[PDB]
Amino acid sequence: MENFQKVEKIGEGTYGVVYKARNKLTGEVVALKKIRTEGVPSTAIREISLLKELNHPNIVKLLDVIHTENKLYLVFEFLHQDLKKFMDASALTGIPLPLIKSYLFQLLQGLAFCHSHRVLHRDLKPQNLLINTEGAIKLADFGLARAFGVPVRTYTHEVVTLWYRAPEILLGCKYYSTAVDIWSLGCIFAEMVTRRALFPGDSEIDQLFRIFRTLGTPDEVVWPGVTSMPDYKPSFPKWARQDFSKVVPPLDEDGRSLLSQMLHYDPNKRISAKAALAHPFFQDVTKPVPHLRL
Numbered sequence: 001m002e003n004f005q006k007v008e009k010i011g012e013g014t015y016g017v018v019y020k021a022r023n024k025l026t027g028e029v030v031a032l033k034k035i036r037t038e039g040v041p042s043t044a045i046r047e048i049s050l051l052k053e054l055n056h057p058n059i060v061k062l063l064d065v066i067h068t069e070n071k072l073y074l075v076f077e078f079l080h081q082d083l084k085k086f087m088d089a090s091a092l093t094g095i096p097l098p099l100i101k102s103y104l105f106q107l108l109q110g111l112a113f114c115h116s117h118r119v120l121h122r123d124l125k126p127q128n129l130l131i132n133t134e135g136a137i138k139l140a141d142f143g144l145a146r147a148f149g150v151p152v153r154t155y156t157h158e159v160v161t162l163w164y165r166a167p168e169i170l171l172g173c174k175y176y177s178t179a180v181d182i183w184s185l186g187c188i189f190a191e192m193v194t195r196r197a198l199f200p201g202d203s204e205i206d207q208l209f210r211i212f213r214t215l216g217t218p219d220e221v222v223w224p225g226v227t228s229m230p231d232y233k234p235s236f237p238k239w240a241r242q243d244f245s246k247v248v249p250p251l252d253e254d255g256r257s258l259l260s261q262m263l264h265y266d267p268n269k270r271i272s273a274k275a276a277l278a279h280p281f282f283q284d285v286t287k288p289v290p291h292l293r294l
């Protein structure tokens with residue numbers, strides 16, 4: 001891009017390719033996302049444009065929205081490392097519990113803020129969570145999903161990750177609620193703790209069944225209305241719920257209790273980000289400095 005200089009290709013998300021770039025004129029280093037195409041809804045640019053007004057310490061700042069030559073560019077403040085990379089780098093020893101707790105607390109503050117502003121993420125995953133050297137963690141790509149839709153993959157033949165998708169989405173619900181983000185974050189919390197994805201599905205049905213094998217096949221008792229969901233099939237196998245202490249060992253009972261509330265089947269029973277911030281698990285929360293190798 002004439003105004004910048006692709007330092008490097010950062011990565012690839014469900015909505016587009018991300019680049020690290022320096023504003024040739026201002027020298028500011030930013031993350032530039034290119035949205036993939038002759039229509040380009042004008043209702044979306046307005047939607048996205050409103051996101052520039054979102055300012056919170058745990059939300060990656062959206063600096064600009066540029067529509068040109070069919071291409072759409074989102075300019076974000078740049079952070080050096082995503083959580084997926086950090087988890088991989090910390091796989092041998094594991095992320096210390098105090099840091100896991102700090103990150104979870106911060107992410108809930110970010111979700112509490114967005115949700116109070118009626119903004120949902122809808123596609124949270126480790127790759128969408130960014131960290132810096134001072135111990136902060138921030139959510140990136142909030143609200144893009146709503147202003148947009150949902151491509152078959154990403155944009156150019158790439159396996160979209162289903163591991164963090166809430167059951168109501170997998171069952172075909174047409175209306176999403178803030179609960180979908182709490183579910184994704186619970187899946188991420190578990191993954192930081194055990195160092196293994198909680199529900200690593202390789203297909204939509206495998207994703208759903210992995211959830212059922214662990215949390216039990218949902219029924220009308222625990223989830224009123226589940227048997228009427230669009231993709232619910234009476235033929236789903238009926239698996240018994242697993243003892244919860246086997247899911248995220250060796251997490252303590254405060255942590256297991258909070259996780260269980262973030263993973264309730266019924267979106268209406270699932271804990272809100274604000275209520276989660278008050279959970280006893282955070283009574284001793286601190287803000288540790290991570291060991292980041294950049």
Ligand SMILES: Nc1nc(N)nc(-c2cc(F)ccc2O)n1
Pocket residue numbers: 010011018031033060076077078079080081082127130140141
């Ligand atoms: N994979 C990756 N890696 C890194 N380092 N950064 C980012 C990044 C993504 C955004 F959407 C906004 C800002 C960012 O910095 N993404």
